[PDB]
Design an enzyme around this catalytic site. Structure first.
Site, PDB file in Angstrom:
ATOM      1  N   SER A 239       0.832  -1.193   0.000  1.00 47.47           N
ATOM      2  CA  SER A 239       0.000   0.000   0.000  1.00 47.47           C
ATOM      3  C   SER A 239       0.876   1.256   0.000  1.00 47.47           C
ATOM      4  O   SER A 239       2.109   1.194  -0.082  1.00 47.47           O
ATOM      5  CB  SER A 239      -1.029  -0.065   1.141  1.00 47.47           C
ATOM      6  OG  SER A 239      -0.450  -0.250   2.423  1.00 47.47           O
ATOM      7  N   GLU A 260       4.893  -0.167  -7.022  1.00 50.72           N
ATOM      8  CA  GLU A 260       3.507  -0.378  -7.442  1.00 50.72           C
ATOM      9  C   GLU A 260       2.691  -0.452  -6.156  1.00 50.72           C
ATOM     10  O   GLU A 260       2.651  -1.492  -5.488  1.00 50.72           O
ATOM     11  CB  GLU A 260       3.366  -1.634  -8.293  1.00 50.72           C
ATOM     12  CG  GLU A 260       2.047  -1.748  -9.069  1.00 50.72           C
ATOM     13  CD  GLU A 260       0.892  -2.202  -8.187  1.00 50.72           C
ATOM     14  OE1 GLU A 260       0.111  -1.344  -7.729  1.00 50.72           O
ATOM     15  OE2 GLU A 260       0.787  -3.423  -7.937  1.00 50.72           O
ATOM     16  N   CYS A 294      -4.885  -4.670  -6.032  1.00 52.89           N
ATOM     17  CA  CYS A 294      -4.402  -3.345  -6.404  1.00 52.89           C
ATOM     18  C   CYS A 294      -5.334  -2.694  -7.423  1.00 52.89           C
ATOM     19  O   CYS A 294      -5.591  -1.486  -7.357  1.00 52.89           O
ATOM     20  CB  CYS A 294      -2.977  -3.441  -6.946  1.00 52.89           C
ATOM     21  SG  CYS A 294      -1.785  -3.964  -5.675  1.00 52.89           S
TER      22      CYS A 294
END
Ligand SMILES: O=C(O)c1ccccn1
Ligand SMILES: O=C(O)c1ccccn1
Ligand SMILES: O=C(O)c1ccccn1
Lengths: 499, 508, 508, 499
Positions: A239, A260, A294
């Protein structure tokens, strides 16, 4: 719900079949767990920060040999690994379901992602293309070449506990790098199984033993990996908080990062959207993996002329979602990963209603007495009067906020307004709206799709996003370039220099 | 030697600025000063921007970006073509300013302006390319592609030593990529930047392009820091010493921005037993002494095989003794002055420390005609033979000092090349086919630029320019360096009217 | 309407030629003649080359190639940059010659000259690229790469309708690729070629480049045939009617040469029920009637959904009736003349045959003001509604005839598009996202160019230009079309000092 | 020498194991043969020209389905084919030795080339890259896409009876094409085995049956394939005569060709050449495959200062070459393909001596009584006073002509002077000479190498040559583009057109 004893026996069987030595990895420092029941499975040995330093040393020594091993030979190792993953696909998928809580079809799909990137990397192993190009200098030649970089630190998350590492490791190994992997504290068993299968491929190939190592432990282990002066590339998935740790401190030692950090992904629903298509796509992208991708759909930006009917259709669908044991094929939504995930979801929904929103469906915990330590929740659908604070700040839970718009440029602005920028989709039958969404002044995300949801991505594409998602790319296209170093070579064969 | 007077330099600077369209009355002031290394003196005072002015400039650049990013790239290229024509028209004037502010000889100043013209021509070609990809998708009735989009405002931090080419690399490429630019030039070289910006502003007016496409901010460190910290600047391109790295890199990373960092080099050349010694001595002198050792690509370490080390040192000693040092406007000059007194001080401290670490000063190192221009630092490049690669050799000094090291096995030369913390450029001089290839191989030289029979400044527009390790990792100019100025998008387009049903369930 | 007189046209042609540096005395003669479709008349006589002169020109071009191929490509690009500057300087003069010889309106003539300038700018960018590849090898201690090298003399055969842009595409790219060029222009348009070559020869003189880099050969078919047959011409680029294909393709193949063939199109646009009819009618008129239907990319077939076919025909009928036909030098003119009487004859025969095959002539087809310029053929573009795609529709006539066909299912429209033997360009007008993508999909339109909501002439410098089937397969201008002008080499470099021993045996 | 009965039984066993139905392919129209003894093995059915037309029809019908099958799915078929080739590598290699006469190590290497291009094509199946690029038009988008072409006609030769087809078929199938294969009349059994294995992969994949078909027969069958209006690409490998047939007539119907017509390949030996390396490299490249490679070394251009010692060393090596049964591991040189090959070799050597050359070693037929129908010959080494007619015209036999030079530019001119242009090598320790050889004014061939011979090539490189070699490229880099058609797509989303 599957019993904890049954789950533990399945996990030990899968680990043994994948070549893990259970006696060697068991211990008292960490505990493997399952979101299916919330129960601890068994205790594990942990690594220390000095163990991380030793692992980096071993990976670097392996790298000194691997970097001059011809890339097609490095590809042969990855080809063999893909064959072993194919052979043990069901065993690995069982561990993915047990540790991440995702339904078996998604666990199998995640293992298949590993096999597919192996096949792609075998192709890359004969490419890794640089360039040749003219030089302005008479009697000289000019080229650009690409070289192995070194040890790659991989930090992965609980929600894709095998595919992200496979993206990084298959590409890194073909690029002549070696890997030190720090998996999520929540999903160590998947990583142990992956590493054991790769070690088997390494043995069959006669390759150096230090090509890949797993370090199991808490935050201090990952910190030591991030700070290592012999780790020129850190690939981190997690996160948003992981960016402000990893990015700046790796930059401070002149290292490279691939970041990412998730998304707050939106889809725009235009007046001409096929509503059956849109409802199905939205349900899958918002509720799949219990909202723990995600790429999960978290914001639906719907034209005011169809907003009422879209909310009515989504309400009906959300009320019908099958929640339950992820080993049952009838299940669509498995459990959230732990109690804190449930608490954060509840807090976001409570904040949304205090900020003017209306809970249309979902949000309630399901059959708590069937497994008091596990958190099965119905995905929440919340109609919002504006994109308020709670909408702009992602919660890693199945909450779909519904916003309305009239002009397409305002839908695009609503898409782009949030700090994250991973993926976006537009549902439309209109040729011009589709192109406007994908134009330079359209959606600002790393992934931007037409008539498919925010999880629409595949191996051949570069995966990643912009803004607070972190800017990194993995998997396809020429993402491999982040794992190598570019050299520009001028060669004089004329015997002369300008005076 | 005879050195131009400060008043003559100022008059030439003012003429060049006026010819390039600068309004001298508007840019003059009392906050900062333009200066010249030719005499060390201030030329005249300048108005300065405040940090608040930087934020205003960035917001104006962002407004321009909102229009520029949907201006077709070939039209954006037309602006850059027009700018290249104006640079060609004013090449001599701009080169005058480069010599005045950077101290480099006339021919190098002209060459740097020509670099600007060449990257303009290259960027005009790029404006019809900026290639993404189309590729198969595994999904029936779908299409997949990768597109590239304009990023936003680009902050450019440049150094004194290439006061126009580095900005040109960044601006020509950024503009055709649909970005806009806010430029913080070196505090030592504002006039070159004012002249460049005035010419580009004329091109913008001719083209009917948005006025905020490029702006120069003149200031001290607080002006640069405000640019680096702006949340509206998604890319910072910074060229400078190593210290610029720990500044810019982590700060921009901390706000999820992108950086291109090129922080100089400690560049070496390997001289093998089969090296053509006439070629090698000429190349080494040019690369070590050129620009008074103030190139990012300057040759600072020479790694010479023990069989030929003595004769190579003898020839280099004689060549260093013959170097013509003087006014960079005189055609006879090959070595102009160091940029300022602090640069001279660091050079003297390094040479003194090298001899204390066991080295032998073979030639040079002395300040030339100090009374002829007492505020200016003309020095003869130093040649220092070293018994080992000690601390002073590994720490680069931005000055003309060439350390000579000896080796026996090629793998030792490669280790000596690679052992330093910088990694910009490297070269090998050899007639042996296998040595040349070994030097360029994956276990060879570790630098971003690695050359055969050409020195450490051997680079050109068409190649990606930059290096590894503490050089900072960035690439500018050629190949596909332009991708750092844009954002990648991966697009899946469904035209099948259908979606995969999760668990086979149709919720409609 | 009022048409310029032959004497006025000749005076303007001579002025343009002299301004572009042509020596009128040297090129005039009695063997061939320059002419103008504006009146159909001969302007003045020209000297001609013999087949022997072609062989001499090719050998001189090959001598130039032997020097040019080792001239660094960025230096070769500098020549092309200089040529682009001269084209810019003489844009109006060259455009005058394009209008005079091709008959196209002033704005199209200017646009064609601008195409030349644009490909020059593109080729200057290419001159620092011409990218090959570096890639891993399976062999330890080896390196592998792919390089691109200059090919040799390129023979360019161009047509009357784009008398300067096609050569410019070929010559700008060939020259930066290290090739040289021998150009056989259309027998109908020699003056444009003489002017282009004179400007390039000036650029060559300014650059100090080899004199034989480009030569124009003026002649009839035997001159072109000798060029095609030359064993010293490894690439022939030919643009013209379909008949040029069976000529050039097999002959050059028979001597192991390479060809780039672009032999025109029979291009269709599909009009779906959701099409924006104002957009579609404007695009269709421009693409069907522009250049008097004498573009390779001209719209010749309109495939319209049955639900809107009647209203589309009504609007097209009204638009065709309002087309301004006249002297192409007048700003009021949109449609100039056909090239010659034979073109008019073939147009009339096609329209007559279409009505005999069941069609209905909706508008146009008649010769305009025949007495005003009796040797010139100004015609109103014809609109013909057809009940089926019969023989006359499938056989393209190089004339402004738009055949209207109706369809119901999109797959039927795609079949109608694809059924013809040509395959240059296609377009679809639709507001429907799925139809647009279906048209461009692998089972969609089969043409080399396939567009959405822009007509069949929708192409630009940055794209590869050319088509499939009897269009001939070649590509020119953009993307990596340049690779057809060079030869690929795959290089394995062993630096290990060792070779694999066959059966393990060491024969030393 | 292996007996004909033993060879026939080995061939039938390999065919059966690869899935060939022996009853269905046997017949009376053609005969399979072996160069090991010269004997006929058994009779085969032949196809007629109408059979070719039927095969093209079936391939085209398959193409209509295959061209919309996603390329990664097409890659899965090729992945499966590669697995079957791996499983049957020894069986296929036996057929390659039996029909082509090449030694077993080379037969295994040729089958491995098939497996490697399969792996490469699986990577390509997620790439097949076109471009996206800016358009000059406001509110438009521009891209370049690549599409399946159609039916690909493959004409292969006896000397690489499986690898050339595999290059074409693996790439063509991933590109969405289908294949009609006309193998050499000399090597039909290898083709039948390859096709049967691919049909098995097709069945496992559920793919269309007409993706690949073999047509067995004489010249009339290949002519009908070349002339088919539904075959947009013909890939032809063979000697130079195949160009003047295939190239012009395919061009006459606006089709595309890939032509690879062999070479007359030279290596330059400079004064600084490592002579042990050079001798080994030259022996392998000149004598390997009994001089029957497209890439065989036929011309050695040696500096006058070392020419005597190089000829002395090569003479000794040539006298030591082990000639014999290609199933014996001690063999380096197996037999020539048939009597005509031997006759043409003898005629070239006789012409060379009449043109002033000296036979230094080789040329004699070996143990004729051991197998009177087979032609085992020692490779010939011939020193020549100049590059005369016989040197410039390739003979497909092991003859190595030795020429001398002094100036490197003259060595390059001698390399370039011949009508063919496949491969070239330079042996040198000199950095500048190596680069000069590879420079634009250096060797003119499609393959140009440093310190490795004329057969130095691999899967990742584009394979093919210039001049009378025909200009085509196969296998690596972006050779795949010849199997697809380029489309340039402009998309207007602005609703307007220039007036
Ligand atoms: O150090 C160099 O050689 C350099 C630096 C920046 C720009 C051009 N050249
Ligand atoms: O037909 C066309 O549109 C065309 C042909 C050649 C050159 C430019 N345009
Ligand atoms: O001649 C060669 O070396 C060759 C020919 C075809 C396929 C593989 N190799």
């Amino acid at each position: 719900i599957s019993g904890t004893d049954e789950i533990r026996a399945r996990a030990e069987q899968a680990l043994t079949r994948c070549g893990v030595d259970l006696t060697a990895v068991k211990g008292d420092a960490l505990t493997a767990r399952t979101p299916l029941t919330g129960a601890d499975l068994f205790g594990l040995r942990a690594q220390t920060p000095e163990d991380v330093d030793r692992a980096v040393e071993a990976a670097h020594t392996a790298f000194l040999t691997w970097r001059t091993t011809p890339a097609p030979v490095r590809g042969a190792l990855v080809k063999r690994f893909g064959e072993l993953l194919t052979e043990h696909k069901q065993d690995l998928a069982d561990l993915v379901t047990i540790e991440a809580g995702k339904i078996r079809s998604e666990a199998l799909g995640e293992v298949q992602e590993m096999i597919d990137i192996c096949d792609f990397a075998v192709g890359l192993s004969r490419q890794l293309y640089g360039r040749t190009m003219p030089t302005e200098r008479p009697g000289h030649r000019l080229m650009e070449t690409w070289h192995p970089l070194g040890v790659v630190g991989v930090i992965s998350a609980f929600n894709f506990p095998v595919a992200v590492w496979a993206w990084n490791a298959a590409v890194a190994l073909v690029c002549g790098d070696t890997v030190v992997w720090k998996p999520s504290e929540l999903t160590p068993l998947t990583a142990l199984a992956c590493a054991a299968l790769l070690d088997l491929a390494i043995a069959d190939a006669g390759a150096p033993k230090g090509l890949n190592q797993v370090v199991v432990g808490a935050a201090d282990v990952g910190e030591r990996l991030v700070d290592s002066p012999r780790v020129p590339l850190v690939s981190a998935t997690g996160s948003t908080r992981m960016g402000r740790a990893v990015g700046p401190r790796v930059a401070a030692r002149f290292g490279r990062t691939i970041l990412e950090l998730g998304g707050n992904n939106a889809a725009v629903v235009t007046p001409s959207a096929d509503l059956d298509l849109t409802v199905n796509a939205a349900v899958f992208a918002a509720a799949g993996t219990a909202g723990q991708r995600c790429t999960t759909l978290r914001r639906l930006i719907v034209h005011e002329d169809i907003a009422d009917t879209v909310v009515e259709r989504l309400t009906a669908a959300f009320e019908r979602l099958p929640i339950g044991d992820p080993f049952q094929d009838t299940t669509l939504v498995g459990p959230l990963v732990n109690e804190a995930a449930f608490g954060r979801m509840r807090e976001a929904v409570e904040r949304a209603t205090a900020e003017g929103g209306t809970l249309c469906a979902g949000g309630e915990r399901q059959f708590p007495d069937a497994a008091p330590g596990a958190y099965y929740v119905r995905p929440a659908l919340v109609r919002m009067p504006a994109q308020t604070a709670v909408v702009r700040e992602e919660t890693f839970a199945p909450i779909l906020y519904v916003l309305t718009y009239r002009d397409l440029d305002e839908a695009i602005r609503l898409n782009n307004e949030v700090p994250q920028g991973l993926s976006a989709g537009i549902f439309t039958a209109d040729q011009s709206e589709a192109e406007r969404f994908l134009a330079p002044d359209g959606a600002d995300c790393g992934i931007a799709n037409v008539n498919i949801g925010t999880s629409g991505a595949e191996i051949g594409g570069a995966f990643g996003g912009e803004k607070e998602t972190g800017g990194g790319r993995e998997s396809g296209s020429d993402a491999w370039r982040a794992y190598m170093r570019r050299a520009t070579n001028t060669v004089n064969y004329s015997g002369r220099v300008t005076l």
